[PDB]
Enzyme design. Structure first.
Site, PDB file in Angstrom:
ATOM      1  CG  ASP A  36      -6.865  -2.005  -4.028  1.00 47.32           C
ATOM      2  OD1 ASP A  36      -7.128  -0.796  -3.840  1.00 47.32           O
ATOM      3  OD2 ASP A  36      -5.700  -2.457  -3.907  1.00 47.32           O
TER       4      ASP A  36
ATOM      5  CG  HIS B 254      -5.827  -1.480  -0.599  1.00 44.49           C
ATOM      6  ND1 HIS B 254      -5.305  -0.906   0.546  1.00 44.49           N
ATOM      7  CD2 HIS B 254      -4.871  -1.356  -1.545  1.00 44.49           C
ATOM      8  CE1 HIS B 254      -4.142  -0.344   0.259  1.00 44.49           C
ATOM      9  NE2 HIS B 254      -3.881  -0.562  -1.018  1.00 44.49           N
TER      10      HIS B 254
ATOM     11  CB  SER C 110      -0.990  -0.048   1.160  1.00 43.11           C
ATOM     12  OG  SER C 110      -2.008   0.958   1.030  1.00 43.11           O
TER      13      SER C 110
END
Lengths: 283, 283
Positions: B223, B253, B130
């Site tokens: 995501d 995600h 991320s």
């Protein structure tokens, strides 16, 4: 080129591809319900006991064989550290549907019932690519019906349905190696009649997928079969089966066969090796 | 909830998670250009020499830390059989951009220059999830600029660009854990002014990606960051860099953080382990 010429070409092209050393290889004959089924047994370099992966080559039910798939099965064996048994199921058009399915299931059942020959105490999985993925999937369905409890199924860009509608079929049906024209022609060689399009043994998406083994399903971005692979993963998930569904981007149908020079194929084999080590060994 | 409380909830929930044994753990403090940077060094149970993965946690540049990522870093260490160094970079809003970047690159340079301390003869890779994948990518770009030769970069659903246009942003921007509102809020905490949107150290997609280390890029189907992850892979590929870009279907995600419960996260960790064993050890 004739079908025979192409079958020969598959074997010739294989000799360009390096064959990894494994532990020990044996060629065996499995007594099937309709035929004696050749299979090649690959042992890994590690010490047993083992899990056993029964593998079905791809090639549109017409092409491919144990020899042309020998480099890939050696690589899988070393990656999974598991006994791999590569099955020489009968081919079309000489042997129409459901001959390939009958052989594939007969081989699995024999392996399941003879797993001690291979020190296969950690259980049995099935796997295959393309048409082979179709056979692995169908074999897993048929195994449920006979209370044969498999550990796992590895479906590498499988064919799971007759298809005239997915977006991937139209987007990717020319220019990416496996074409519409091929898919039609293979179907014509394999099937006996239009009615076989109703048969889950050809289109396993039709089946009730509850209680099937957990799956790894690999699809390729530029593959006319992409969407239907994803569908099979989805229907498994909806049916309460655990599935890791991974789309490998930037690659075409067949890419795992080309592992020596398509690095994504090598990484796909690494992933296959990881999930089977996990399920067989807890590693 | 204040920033403090949001951080503490994250640490709280991660506290619950069984931690895998590894070989040996050493906490160190790296002398950064702007601050002392805590790092945690995880050794696998195998013996050396090793490759070394420098790992940057996610959390939107605002949360996460060494402790809360400890279970994941242990799992990655055992999977890659490599020394993993988890970096406690400075968080926003207290430390604005580019503090996280400065710390992440300072740590990497120090590890690179001190590789013998870890018996790291097989080289250095970077990775992160991320916001951490953003920091890994930016670190690899800054390394190239200074002739630091990295082996690999592992980018797990990275943030690579400010985005008002991708289809995945609009399709997945609500209901899947990371929302538009979260993306907006993290960016507001992290960045100083609109000018920073021009800075490749925030949006690495802007950089020239030639001659960067080969990559594994994992994206998640549901995501909002999915498409921009694929874009980064494709821009690398266009720039002559080898990339294995894999979309994990059916997941959201952050899914790798949920590996104890979401089996696809475990399989992603297996894949990450494979590619790093391959690049470091030839294995």
């Amino acid at each position: 080129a004739s079908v025979e010429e192409i079958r020969s070409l598959f074997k010739q092209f294989s000799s360009l591809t390096p064959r990894e050393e494994v532990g020990k290889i044996e060629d065996i004959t499995i007594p099937g319900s309709e035929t004696n089924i050749k299979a090649r047994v690959y042992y890994p370099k590690t010490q047993g006991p083992y899990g056993v992966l029964v593998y079905y080559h791809g090639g549109g039910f017409v092409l491919g064989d144990i020899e042309s798939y020998d480099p890939l099965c050696r690589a899988i064996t070393n990656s999974c550290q598991c006994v791999t048994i590569s099955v020489d199921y009968r081919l079309a058009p000489e042997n129409k549907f459901p001959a390939a399915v009958v052989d594939s299931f007969d081989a699995l059942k024999w392996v399941y019932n003879n797993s001690e020959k291979f020190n296969g105490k950690y259980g049995i999985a099935v796997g295959g690519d393309s048409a082979g993925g179709n056979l692995a999937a169908v074999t897993a369905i048929l195994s449920k019906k006979e209370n044969i409890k498999l550990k796992y199924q590895v479906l590498i860009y499988p064919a799971v349905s007759f298809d005239l509608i997915t977006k991937s079929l139209y987007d990717n049906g020319e220019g990416f190696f496996l074409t519409r024209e091929h898919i039609d022609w293979f179907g014509q060689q394999y099937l006996r009649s239009f009615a076989d399009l109703l048969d889950f043994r050809f289109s396993p998406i039709l089946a009730d997928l509850n209680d099937l083994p957990p799956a790894l399903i690999i699809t390729a971005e530029h593959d006319p079969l992409r969407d239907q692979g994803e569908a099979y993963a989805n229907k498994l998930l909806q049916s309460g089966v655990q599935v890791t569904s991974v789309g490998f981007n930037n690659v075409i149908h067949g890419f795992v066969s080309f592992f020596p020079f398509i690095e994504q194929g090598r990484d796909a084999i690494g992933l296959i090796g990881y999930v089977l080590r996990k399920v067989f060994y807890g590693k």
